[PDB]
């Protein structure tokens with residue numbers, strides 16, 4: 001029923017990439033008509049899910065801020081379910097939620113290496129999608145916990161498969177992208193190939209699509225382990241390989257996941273989400 005032109009106007013942002021060669025829109029501030037989309041989705045009575053992992057000190061350092069900002073800005077006006085995965089439920093910061101927000105917490109096993117904690121999310125998310133998320137929501141977003149919502153992050157971001165443009169490389173050329181370049185890895189992307197550099201901090205789509213994204217990425221992660229190699233940027237390297245092979249039906253501009261360390265250039269009109277300063281010395285316990 002919904003057609004791209006119904007809610008997307010690329011001409012509102014002529015100075016940036018608004019359309020991919022495969023006709024997927026790149027959502028920038030100014031190009032979307034949220035009112036039209038809210039009405040459309042509200043009539044379908046959709047529910048949107050959001051998964052977030054917090055293992056170790058990531059809990060105390062970022063979970064409350066993430067949840068509090070999500071409650072305030074994520075898909076306002078629509079039912080939302082926050083799926084919280086932590087290794088220690090007793091440290092779960094139970095904040096007060098607002099209208100249309102609800103949640104559930106799951107205790108997970110903490111992997112030894114932070115690299116595996118980050119990558120195991122792919123296996124875990126898949127298991128939960130099959131077990132219950134597929135029956136609970138129409139769209140699902142999987143996000144890093146080390147970031148905070150700054151403004152409305154709404155229905156204009158929904159789609160079959162959604163990818164996020166990484167803030168530092170959205171204007172670079174593919175051969176400058178930090179893809180995994182070793183042919184021995186399942187995440188390998190040869191120079192001369194690639195569309196964009198996607199950030200693994202945010203990705204989503206329908207439960208069916210996210211299930212395939214996560215399943216394929218974990219298959220690549222497991223394969224590399226058998227070949228004694230680990231992608232340079234772990235799950236992000238694999239996610240980029242996946243989105244190269246299976247193009248996302250929608251892409252979000254850096255405005256949806258911005259790093260203020262860069263400053264605030266002209267292209268970034270309204271920040272919906274921002275990066276948390278890195279604190280590896282404290283939140284990570286290995287290499």
Ligand SMILES: O=c1ccn([C@@H]2O[C@H](COP(=O)(O)OP(=O)(O)O)[C@@H](O)[C@H]2O)c(=O)[nH]1
Pocket residue numbers: 052053054055056058113114115117118143144145146201278283284
């Ligand atoms: O010890 C760890 C490592 C990773 N994570 C989760 O995995 C995501 C990916 O990690 P990180 O944010 O450290 O990656 P970076 O964005 O800095 O590459 C984090 O946001 C967390 O949600 C976690 O909870 N504990």
Ligand SMILES: [Mn+2]
Pocket residue numbers: 144145146201
């Ligand atoms: Mn992160």
